[PDB]
Protein backbone atom coordinates (compact mmCIF):
# COMPACT_ATOMS: atom_id res chain seq x y z
CA UNK A 1 0.00 0.00 0.00
CA UNK A 2 2.23 2.80 1.29
CA UNK A 3 5.17 3.51 -1.02
CA UNK A 4 7.23 6.49 -2.08
CA UNK A 5 5.50 8.61 -4.77
CA UNK A 6 8.72 8.67 -6.84
CA UNK A 7 8.85 4.95 -7.73
CA UNK A 8 5.33 3.56 -8.14
CA UNK A 9 3.60 6.83 -8.99
CA UNK A 10 6.38 7.27 -11.58
CA UNK A 11 6.52 3.73 -13.02
CA UNK A 12 2.73 3.21 -13.28
CA UNK A 13 2.74 4.28 -16.92
CA UNK A 14 2.80 2.68 -20.37
CA UNK A 15 4.85 4.49 -23.01
CA UNK A 16 3.24 4.52 -26.46
CA UNK A 17 4.44 5.96 -29.76
CA UNK A 18 1.12 6.94 -31.36
CA UNK A 19 2.22 10.58 -31.47
CA UNK A 20 5.26 9.69 -33.60
CA UNK A 21 4.99 10.81 -37.23
CA UNK A 22 1.45 12.08 -36.60
CA UNK A 23 1.93 15.01 -39.00
CA UNK A 24 3.79 15.28 -42.30
CA UNK A 25 5.62 17.80 -44.49
CA UNK A 26 4.68 19.50 -47.74
CA UNK A 27 5.14 17.16 -50.73
CA UNK A 28 7.90 17.59 -53.27
CA UNK A 29 6.97 20.01 -56.05
CA UNK A 30 10.19 21.34 -57.64
CA UNK A 31 9.94 18.66 -60.34
CA UNK A 32 6.95 20.43 -61.91
CA UNK A 33 8.93 23.69 -62.29
CA UNK A 34 12.51 22.51 -62.85
CA UNK A 35 14.60 19.97 -64.75
CA UNK A 36 17.49 18.01 -63.25
CA UNK A 37 20.85 18.64 -64.91
CA UNK A 38 23.70 16.69 -63.28
CA UNK A 39 27.05 18.44 -62.91
CA UNK A 40 30.57 16.99 -62.83
CA UNK A 41 32.73 20.04 -61.99
CA UNK A 42 32.65 23.34 -60.12
CA UNK A 43 30.29 25.07 -62.58
CA UNK A 44 28.35 24.41 -65.77
CA UNK A 45 28.52 26.70 -68.81
CA UNK A 46 25.59 26.69 -71.24
CA UNK A 47 25.69 27.68 -74.89
CA UNK A 48 23.10 27.63 -77.67
CA UNK A 49 22.99 28.87 -81.25
CA UNK A 50 20.74 31.62 -82.55
Amino acid sequence: AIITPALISALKTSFQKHFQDALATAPSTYLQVATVIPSTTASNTYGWLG
Partner: protein, 253 residues
Protein backbone atom coordinates in the same frame (compact mmCIF):
# COMPACT_ATOMS: atom_id res chain seq x y z
CA UNK B 1 13.08 17.40 -36.82
CA UNK B 2 16.61 17.43 -38.18
CA UNK B 3 18.13 20.92 -38.51
CA UNK B 4 17.68 22.62 -41.86
CA UNK B 5 20.43 22.61 -44.47
CA UNK B 6 22.94 25.45 -44.20
CA UNK B 7 25.60 26.93 -46.45
CA UNK B 8 28.99 25.55 -45.41
CA UNK B 9 31.07 28.48 -44.13
CA UNK B 10 34.06 27.88 -41.88
CA UNK B 11 33.28 25.14 -39.38
CA UNK B 12 29.87 23.63 -38.58
CA UNK B 13 27.34 24.71 -35.98
CA UNK B 14 26.55 21.47 -34.14
CA UNK B 15 22.86 21.74 -33.25
CA UNK B 16 20.54 19.79 -30.95
CA UNK B 17 17.24 17.99 -31.42
CA UNK B 18 14.07 18.55 -29.37
CA UNK B 19 12.16 15.62 -27.89
CA UNK B 20 8.60 16.22 -26.70
CA UNK B 21 6.34 14.42 -24.27
CA UNK B 22 2.68 14.27 -23.32
CA UNK B 23 1.35 12.84 -20.04
CA UNK B 24 -2.27 12.11 -19.17
CA UNK B 25 -3.79 10.00 -16.40
CA UNK B 26 -6.91 7.85 -16.29
CA UNK B 27 -9.99 8.89 -14.30
CA UNK B 28 -12.70 6.90 -12.55
CA UNK B 29 -16.38 7.29 -13.44
CA UNK B 30 -19.67 5.83 -12.22
CA UNK B 31 -23.42 6.42 -12.34
CA UNK B 32 -25.55 4.76 -9.67
CA UNK B 33 -29.32 4.66 -9.09
CA UNK B 34 -31.07 3.27 -6.01
CA UNK B 35 -34.64 1.98 -5.67
CA UNK B 36 -36.69 -0.04 -3.18
CA UNK B 37 -37.92 -3.63 -3.13
CA UNK B 38 -41.55 -2.66 -2.57
CA UNK B 39 -41.43 -0.23 -5.50
CA UNK B 40 -40.33 -2.75 -8.13
CA UNK B 41 -42.19 -5.75 -6.70
CA UNK B 42 -45.43 -3.73 -6.55
CA UNK B 43 -44.91 -2.39 -10.10
CA UNK B 44 -47.66 -4.32 -11.87
CA UNK B 45 -47.66 -1.93 -14.84
CA UNK B 46 -44.11 -2.91 -15.82
CA UNK B 47 -42.97 0.63 -16.67
CA UNK B 48 -40.41 0.78 -13.87
CA UNK B 49 -37.80 -1.84 -14.82
CA UNK B 50 -36.20 -0.57 -18.04
CA UNK B 51 -33.43 0.55 -15.68
CA UNK B 52 -31.06 -2.08 -17.06
CA UNK B 53 -31.26 -0.91 -20.67
CA UNK B 54 -31.37 2.78 -19.71
CA UNK B 55 -28.16 2.31 -17.71
CA UNK B 56 -26.57 0.34 -20.54
CA UNK B 57 -27.26 3.09 -23.06
CA UNK B 58 -26.01 5.72 -20.61
CA UNK B 59 -22.74 3.80 -20.36
CA UNK B 60 -22.65 3.55 -24.15
CA UNK B 61 -23.24 7.29 -24.54
CA UNK B 62 -20.64 8.37 -21.95
CA UNK B 63 -17.73 8.54 -24.48
CA UNK B 64 -19.66 10.99 -26.68
CA UNK B 65 -20.22 13.28 -23.71
CA UNK B 66 -16.56 13.07 -22.67
CA UNK B 67 -15.11 13.74 -26.12
CA UNK B 68 -17.46 16.58 -27.04
CA UNK B 69 -17.17 18.25 -23.62
CA UNK B 70 -13.40 18.18 -24.15
CA UNK B 71 -13.90 19.71 -27.60
CA UNK B 72 -16.02 22.45 -26.02
CA UNK B 73 -13.42 23.12 -23.31
CA UNK B 74 -10.48 23.02 -25.72
CA UNK B 75 -10.12 26.77 -25.17
CA UNK B 76 -9.45 26.06 -21.46
CA UNK B 77 -7.51 22.78 -21.33
CA UNK B 78 -3.82 22.74 -22.26
CA UNK B 79 -2.04 20.83 -25.01
CA UNK B 80 1.50 19.43 -24.93
CA UNK B 81 3.28 22.71 -25.71
CA UNK B 82 1.89 24.43 -22.61
CA UNK B 83 -0.89 26.69 -23.89
CA UNK B 84 -4.59 26.02 -24.35
CA UNK B 85 -5.49 23.72 -27.23
CA UNK B 86 -7.26 26.67 -28.87
CA UNK B 87 -5.12 29.71 -28.05
CA UNK B 88 -3.85 32.81 -29.82
CA UNK B 89 -0.29 32.37 -28.47
CA UNK B 90 0.96 28.98 -29.63
CA UNK B 91 4.78 29.20 -29.57
CA UNK B 92 7.20 28.48 -32.39
CA UNK B 93 10.99 28.83 -32.15
CA UNK B 94 10.96 32.66 -31.90
CA UNK B 95 7.44 33.05 -33.29
CA UNK B 96 3.94 33.09 -31.81
CA UNK B 97 0.98 31.50 -33.61
CA UNK B 98 -2.76 31.60 -32.96
CA UNK B 99 -5.38 28.95 -33.71
CA UNK B 100 -8.45 30.74 -32.32
CA UNK B 101 -10.23 33.77 -33.77
CA UNK B 102 -12.74 36.00 -31.96
CA UNK B 103 -14.44 39.34 -32.60
CA UNK B 104 -15.33 40.71 -29.14
CA UNK B 105 -18.61 41.86 -30.76
CA UNK B 106 -20.51 38.79 -32.03
CA UNK B 107 -19.16 35.49 -30.66
CA UNK B 108 -22.00 33.00 -30.13
CA UNK B 109 -21.18 29.57 -31.61
CA UNK B 110 -17.85 28.11 -32.73
CA UNK B 111 -17.43 25.89 -35.79
CA UNK B 112 -14.50 23.49 -35.86
CA UNK B 113 -12.26 22.34 -38.72
CA UNK B 114 -10.42 19.06 -38.12
CA UNK B 115 -7.91 17.47 -40.53
CA UNK B 116 -8.69 13.88 -39.57
CA UNK B 117 -6.70 12.47 -42.49
CA UNK B 118 -3.52 12.20 -40.41
CA UNK B 119 -2.71 8.98 -38.57
CA UNK B 120 -3.53 10.57 -35.19
CA UNK B 121 -6.93 12.26 -35.01
CA UNK B 122 -8.02 15.13 -32.75
CA UNK B 123 -9.34 14.96 -29.18
CA UNK B 124 -8.49 11.29 -28.80
CA UNK B 125 -10.02 9.04 -26.14
CA UNK B 126 -8.42 6.25 -24.12
CA UNK B 127 -10.26 3.10 -23.00
CA UNK B 128 -8.57 1.45 -20.01
CA UNK B 129 -11.62 -0.59 -18.93
CA UNK B 130 -14.86 -1.56 -20.72
CA UNK B 131 -18.24 -1.24 -19.01
CA UNK B 132 -19.18 -3.44 -16.05
CA UNK B 133 -22.40 -3.51 -14.03
CA UNK B 134 -23.78 -5.02 -10.82
CA UNK B 135 -27.14 -5.56 -9.10
CA UNK B 136 -28.59 -6.18 -5.61
CA UNK B 137 -31.35 -8.70 -6.36
CA UNK B 138 -30.68 -11.41 -3.77
CA UNK B 139 -31.58 -11.53 -0.06
CA UNK B 140 -27.99 -11.87 1.17
CA UNK B 141 -26.84 -8.44 -0.04
CA UNK B 142 -25.76 -5.93 2.59
CA UNK B 143 -27.71 -3.20 0.78
CA UNK B 144 -30.71 -5.53 0.51
CA UNK B 145 -30.78 -5.62 4.33
CA UNK B 146 -29.50 -2.09 5.07
CA UNK B 147 -32.99 -0.56 4.73
CA UNK B 148 -36.28 -1.63 3.16
CA UNK B 149 -33.97 -2.18 0.22
CA UNK B 150 -31.32 -0.32 -1.76
CA UNK B 151 -31.44 -2.12 -5.12
CA UNK B 152 -28.61 -0.10 -6.60
CA UNK B 153 -27.64 -0.37 -10.25
CA UNK B 154 -24.30 1.28 -11.05
CA UNK B 155 -21.62 1.53 -13.71
CA UNK B 156 -17.83 1.33 -13.47
CA UNK B 157 -15.64 2.89 -16.15
CA UNK B 158 -12.02 4.07 -16.36
CA UNK B 159 -11.70 6.75 -19.05
CA UNK B 160 -10.44 10.24 -19.80
CA UNK B 161 -10.42 12.45 -22.87
CA UNK B 162 -7.10 13.03 -24.62
CA UNK B 163 -5.91 15.51 -27.24
CA UNK B 164 -3.13 15.87 -29.79
CA UNK B 165 -1.33 18.53 -31.85
CA UNK B 166 -2.86 21.92 -31.05
CA UNK B 167 -1.74 23.33 -34.41
CA UNK B 168 -3.43 20.79 -36.70
CA UNK B 169 -6.77 21.91 -35.24
CA UNK B 170 -8.55 25.26 -35.63
CA UNK B 171 -11.79 25.03 -33.70
CA UNK B 172 -12.84 28.47 -32.47
CA UNK B 173 -13.99 31.13 -34.95
CA UNK B 174 -17.24 32.55 -33.55
CA UNK B 175 -17.44 35.52 -35.94
CA UNK B 176 -19.93 34.11 -38.46
CA UNK B 177 -20.37 31.34 -41.02
CA UNK B 178 -23.02 32.57 -43.49
CA UNK B 179 -23.94 35.81 -45.26
CA UNK B 180 -24.15 37.23 -48.77
CA UNK B 181 -20.34 37.35 -48.58
CA UNK B 182 -17.45 37.87 -46.12
CA UNK B 183 -18.98 35.39 -43.63
CA UNK B 184 -19.89 32.58 -46.03
CA UNK B 185 -16.45 32.59 -47.67
CA UNK B 186 -13.96 34.80 -45.81
CA UNK B 187 -14.01 33.38 -42.28
CA UNK B 188 -14.06 29.79 -43.60
CA UNK B 189 -11.37 30.16 -46.26
CA UNK B 190 -9.50 32.13 -43.60
CA UNK B 191 -9.38 29.08 -41.32
CA UNK B 192 -8.56 26.78 -44.24
CA UNK B 193 -5.64 28.92 -45.45
CA UNK B 194 -4.34 29.66 -41.94
CA UNK B 195 -4.20 25.93 -41.21
CA UNK B 196 -2.57 25.26 -44.59
CA UNK B 197 -0.04 28.04 -43.84
CA UNK B 198 1.30 26.64 -40.56
CA UNK B 199 5.05 26.44 -39.94
CA UNK B 200 6.78 23.64 -38.04
CA UNK B 201 9.64 23.83 -35.54
CA UNK B 202 12.61 24.35 -37.85
CA UNK B 203 10.97 26.23 -40.71
CA UNK B 204 9.05 23.58 -42.65
CA UNK B 205 5.34 23.60 -43.59
CA UNK B 206 3.07 21.25 -41.67
CA UNK B 207 1.10 20.08 -44.75
CA UNK B 208 -2.33 20.39 -43.15
CA UNK B 209 -5.32 19.09 -45.13
CA UNK B 210 -8.56 20.16 -43.41
CA UNK B 211 -11.34 17.72 -44.28
CA UNK B 212 -13.89 17.76 -41.41
CA UNK B 213 -16.09 20.70 -40.40
CA UNK B 214 -17.85 20.24 -37.05
CA UNK B 215 -20.65 22.63 -36.08
CA UNK B 216 -23.55 22.65 -33.62
CA UNK B 217 -27.10 22.10 -34.80
CA UNK B 218 -27.65 25.87 -34.93
CA UNK B 219 -24.81 26.58 -37.41
CA UNK B 220 -25.52 23.61 -39.70
CA UNK B 221 -27.32 25.78 -42.26
CA UNK B 222 -24.39 28.19 -42.45
CA UNK B 223 -21.99 25.26 -42.77
CA UNK B 224 -24.12 23.71 -45.51
CA UNK B 225 -24.25 26.88 -47.60
CA UNK B 226 -20.49 27.25 -47.14
CA UNK B 227 -20.00 23.65 -48.32
CA UNK B 228 -22.73 21.65 -50.07
CA UNK B 229 -24.17 24.20 -52.54
CA UNK B 230 -22.93 24.05 -56.13
CA UNK B 231 -24.24 27.34 -57.54
CA UNK B 232 -23.89 30.82 -56.05
CA UNK B 233 -26.40 33.55 -55.23
CA UNK B 234 -25.39 35.34 -58.45
CA UNK B 235 -25.49 32.11 -60.48
CA UNK B 236 -21.74 31.43 -60.26
CA UNK B 237 -19.89 28.59 -58.57
CA UNK B 238 -19.22 28.27 -54.87
CA UNK B 239 -15.41 27.92 -54.87
CA UNK B 240 -15.62 26.07 -51.53
CA UNK B 241 -18.21 23.54 -52.69
CA UNK B 242 -17.30 19.99 -51.62
CA UNK B 243 -14.11 21.40 -50.08
CA UNK B 244 -14.64 19.71 -46.69
CA UNK B 245 -17.27 17.33 -45.35
CA UNK B 246 -19.48 18.80 -42.62
CA UNK B 247 -20.73 16.91 -39.57
CA UNK B 248 -23.58 18.10 -37.35
CA UNK B 249 -23.41 17.21 -33.65
CA UNK B 250 -25.65 18.14 -30.72
CA UNK B 251 -23.11 17.43 -27.95
CA UNK B 252 -21.61 20.95 -28.14
CA UNK B 253 -23.40 24.07 -26.87
Amino acid sequence: QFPKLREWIGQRVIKDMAAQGYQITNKLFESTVGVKRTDIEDDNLGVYGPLMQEMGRAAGAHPDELVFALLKAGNANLCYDGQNFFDTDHPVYPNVDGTGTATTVSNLFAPAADPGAAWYLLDTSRSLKPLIYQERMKPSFTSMTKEDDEQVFMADEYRYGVRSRCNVGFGFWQLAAMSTEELNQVNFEKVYDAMRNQKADGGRPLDIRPNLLVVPTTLRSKAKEVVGVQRLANGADNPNFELVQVLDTAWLN
